[PDB]
Each structure stands twice: as structure tokens, then as C-alpha cells.
């Protein structure tokens, strides 16, 4: 389900649900425009978690472009 909270749980990053919600990312369409600065500004500090989230965003944008 292309919910922000379902997307986060699908990559084991459900700990950041409240971070995304607080930052105003109420849709996945808003998440797909994010960059590394947007991810850090949610308060996400762990390097690998930043890398996993951005890599998922990069892949999801490629899978929706064409």
C-alpha cells in the first residue's frame, strides 16, 4: 500500500513514521522528491538508515519514471 507508513515498514524503517509525519510527508509522492538533506532534516542520523531510505527513494523514482 503506497502509504508513507507502509513504505517505511517495508524497508524496516517504521521507527521514522513520526519523523516523516512531523516533517509533513503525508504522501509517498512527497517522499519521491526527497534528497539526502531532506532525510537528515527529519532527524534521521544513522548513516545506514539514511543510505537505505535514500536508496529506496532513488529506486522508487526510477520504477515510476519511463
Amino acid at each position: 500500500s503506497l502509504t508513507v507508513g507502509d513504505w517505511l515498514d517495508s524497508i524496516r524503517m517504521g521507527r521514522y513514521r513520526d519523523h516523516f509525519a512531523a516533517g509533513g510527508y503525508s504522501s509517498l509522492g512527497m517522499v519521491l522528491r526527497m534528497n539526502a538533506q531532506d532525510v537528515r532534516a527529519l532527524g534521521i542520523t544513522l548513516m545506514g538508515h539514511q543510505k537505505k531510505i535514500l536508496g529506496s527513494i532513488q529506486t522508487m523514482r526510477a520504477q515510476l519514471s519511463s
Partner: protein, 67 residues
Amino acid sequence: FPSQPKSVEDLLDRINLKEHMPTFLFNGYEDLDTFKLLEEEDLDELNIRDPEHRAVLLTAVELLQEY
């Protein structure tokens, strides 16, 4: 697969780099689906500077892309 690394700990044990296990597991690389994203610049940020360690880690990452 039964024969495949089951965890980051298992993988580091197999490649003889358990000294880096707290470094990866305290910096967001606790799961193999994140470990497989590592690149050279990420090892710099993790202060993993030994060239032999670095080559061994990047070989193991390439093998997980197969996984």
C-alpha cells in the same frame, strides 16, 4: 539459502572482520539489505581505513548483490 550469511555478524565472522561489527551495527548497517548498499565513501565515513579490510568488505558486498 541455508549456506548463505544469515546476518551481518555471520558475514563479518566469515570474512574475518568481526572487529568492525560494532561500527556497522551502531551506524545503521545492522541488516544485510543495508550492508549490501556499502560503497568506498561509506567506509571512509565509518573510519574503516585499512586498504586490505576495505577490499575484503567491498568483495563481500558484491557477493550479496547476487543473493
